[PDB]
């Protein structure tokens, strides 16, 4: 009996019927408190209904992206067709621009992502692994610009809208902050940037998965270019990992909030007053956040338990409260015409060239520093050009390689901020 027992957002159907009749009554009588309590209700209900439809679809879920992409499309269409009452538009924009919920969300994700990496791994990575990531970005940029000159697109467009959004962390953290920086430094509209970046990101996601198998076949045909699922060669590992306590009370989760907000305050103060412009360019405070959190991890003040404390909190935001955020993102950012106007053969071929350029750059950079080339590509150019952490379990599963999950996590989590810093630098320098 699918009519009784089928679960929507962890709730049985009759309960959701009661939860939806309330929204319909509120719409009918035109009564709504305009604050957090009024906003969360009508975001939770709409997101819950429209995420399930997206996820439970044959081809959509595995390839396009599934639950999040559907929500911010449907909400944008509702705004376009004029269904929402004015009070609901106000009650949705209020929790997104005056209460500034977006900054809290972004801060929590960044802190949770960077503070969780093991200290020894971070210290060791500064010698051998990070340079491959940098060389991959550099290699992809030149291919992108070269193919751009063929089609007659100027440089400031390719470098700012095509190559940066690809190498982020998806739309969750890596396409919204980029739009905020773009609106802050330059000063033009931000609907255009997000609308025309999301499409290219989702397009490149496909070619990543496609090229995984091709690289596997090449690694079968030739021998020396490959390892047997081993990143480094002629090395031995003797490190024994430290153990967390194993019990994480609520207190540690609460501690997670204190660190997350404080770093934001310090970054805001330093960026606005202490060092407004280190060079000719001016740094947005998100880059300062990334650097400060990295330094805090490096110093070692935090206990091993607290490190795991901020990870559990960042998983509550990124799994449950995301479907609430996407409704607001759809209302305040999306411009439906731009998405349609940005799908063409040229946009496909450019995105397909950029990925191969990244792979080649990472491969040539890995061989200078020990690692086998073919396994230094999957974990440096393919694993990084994705939808963040969602596609890492997909790319590795496309090949028969699971031992590199730690390196994949390092790639996604820590390169999610490197590109942010580079974006601040480039936006400042070019314009």
């Amino acid at each position: 009996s699918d009519l009784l027992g089928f679960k929507i957002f962890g709730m049985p159907l009759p309960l959701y019927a009661f939860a939806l009749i309330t929204l319909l009554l509120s719409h009918f009588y035109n009564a709504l408190p305009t604050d957090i309590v009024g906003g969360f209700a009508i975001m939770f209900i709409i997101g819950a209904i429209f995420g399930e439809i997206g996820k439970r679809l044959p081809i959509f879920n595995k390839y396009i992206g599934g639950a999040p992409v559907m929500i911010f499309l449907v909400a944008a269409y509702f705004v376009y067709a004029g269904i929402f009452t004015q009070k609901e538009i106000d009650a949705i924009s209020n929790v997104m621009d005056k209460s500034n919920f977006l900054n809290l969300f972004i801060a929590v994700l960044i802190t949770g992502a960077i503070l969780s990496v093991n200290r020894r791994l971070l210290l060791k990575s500064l010698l051998g692994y990070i340079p491959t990531i940098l060389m991959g970005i550099v290699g992809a940029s030149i291919f992108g610009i070269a193919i751009g000159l063929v089609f007659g697109i100027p440089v400031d467009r390719i470098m700012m809208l095509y190559v940066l959004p690809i190498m982020g962390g998806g739309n969750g953290a890596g396409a919204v902050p980029l739009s905020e920086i773009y609106h802050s430094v330059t000063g033009r509209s931000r609907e255009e940037y997000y609308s025309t970046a999301i499409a290219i990101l989702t397009i490149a996601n496909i070619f990543a998965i496609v090229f995984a198998a091709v690289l596997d076949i090449i690694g079968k045909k030739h021998t020396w270019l490959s390892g047997e699922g081993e990143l480094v060669r002629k090395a031995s590992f003797k490190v024994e990992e430290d153990e967390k306590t194993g019990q994480i009370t609520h207190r540690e989760t609460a501690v997670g909030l204190v660190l997350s907000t404080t770093c934001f305050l310090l970054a805001y103060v330093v960026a606005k007053k202490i060092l407004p412009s280190i060079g000719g360019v001016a740094i947005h405070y998100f880059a300062w956040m990334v650097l400060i959190v990295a330094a805090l991890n490096a110093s070692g003040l935090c206990s091993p338990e607290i490190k795991a404390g901020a990870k559990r909190l960042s998983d509550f935001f990124s799994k449950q409260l995301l479907w609430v955020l996407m409704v607001g993102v759809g209302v305040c950012y999306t411009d439906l015409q731009e998405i349609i106007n940005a799908i063409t053969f040229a946009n496909v071929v450019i995105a397909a060239i950029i990925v191969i350029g990244a792979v080649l750059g990472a491969a040539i950079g890995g061989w200078l520093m020990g690692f086998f080339p073919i396994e230094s590509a999957i974990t440096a150019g393919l694993c990084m050009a994705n939808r963040g952490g969602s596609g890492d379990l997909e790319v590795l599963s496309a090949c028969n390689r699971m031992n590199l999950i730690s390196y994949a996590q390092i790639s996604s989590r820590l390169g999610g901020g490197i590109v942010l810093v580079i974006a601040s630098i480039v936006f400042g320098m070019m314009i």
Partner: antibody, heavy 119, light 110 residues
Framework: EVQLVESGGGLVQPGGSLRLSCAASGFTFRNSAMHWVRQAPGKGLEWVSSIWYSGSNTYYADSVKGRFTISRDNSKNTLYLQMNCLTAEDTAVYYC????????????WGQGTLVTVSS | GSDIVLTQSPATLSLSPGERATLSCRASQSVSSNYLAWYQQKPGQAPRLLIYDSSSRATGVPARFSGSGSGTDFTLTISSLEPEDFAVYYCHQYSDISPTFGQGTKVEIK
């Protein structure tokens, strides 16, 4: 910052028409209800008309009913007020404002333009 | 007609730096859900918001302004006048589809 700048005409004959426009830069112009407010010299304020987003609902003060038209165009972030068969005693400064509902009534204001009727 | 009418009271109040103001506003009918607001307008300028609800405060306003009252009677007090507080204040209601301002009272120095 948030700024709304308006520009129009003045010195019209006792029978005629005019058009006013204002531009918005600092916020999301779309998704915001907008209002027109006028003030005669040495007098109190007075409401004129209002419009939703998408132009769904329009309401006018009784005094100017049937002679004024209000419309918006989102793509240029511009708001228009159309006056037809203007008459006397409508000489005043004209303002455009943003209505934000419960969280602040009239937060953002323009500078104002002056219109006078010939005699 | 069919419009709630607003009537200011202490027209042309005169005071000296250091004392209170205590203006007043009164309405024809019951304004529902306490929808009312107070502005000021220095000469040759656009107005400015002070008390957006019946009791709340805007962001920039100092901590001496305060208003109260509900139903058909309202007030607005200034604890201690300052040299830059001399202008005309209004009384705005927005409950129904027909907003209606009141007249302005003037605060100047003898």
């Amino acid at each position: 910052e948030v700024q709304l700048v308006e520009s129009g005409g003045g010195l019209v004959q006792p029978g005629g028409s005019l058009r006013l426009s204002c531009a918005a830069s600092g916020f999301t112009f779309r998704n915001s209800a907008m209002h027109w407010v006028r003030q005669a010299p040495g007098k109190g304020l007075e409401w004129v008309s209002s419009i939703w987003y998408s132009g769904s609902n329009t309401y006018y003060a009784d005094s100017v009913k049937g002679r004024f038209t209000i419309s918006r165009d989102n793509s240029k972030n511009t708001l228009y007020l159309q006056m037809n068969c203007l008459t006397a005693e409508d000489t005043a400064v004209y303002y455009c404002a943003r209505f934000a509902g419960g969280w602040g009534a009239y937060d953002v204001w323009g500078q104002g333009t002056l219109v006078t009727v010939s005699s | 007609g069919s419009d709630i009418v607003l009537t200011q009271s202490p027209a042309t109040l005169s005071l000296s730096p250091g004392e209170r103001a205590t203006l007043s506003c009164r309405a024809s009918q019951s304004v529902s859900s306490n929808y009312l607001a107070w502005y000021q307008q220095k000469p040759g300028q656009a107005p400015r918001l002070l008390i957006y609800d019946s009791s709340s405060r805007a962001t920039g306003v100092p901590a001496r302004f305060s208003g109260s009252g509900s139903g058909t009677d309202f007030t607005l007090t200034i604890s201690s006048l300052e040299p830059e507080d001399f202008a005309v204040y209004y009384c705005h209601q927005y409950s129904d589809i027909s907003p209606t301002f009141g007249q302005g009272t003037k605060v100047e120095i003898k």
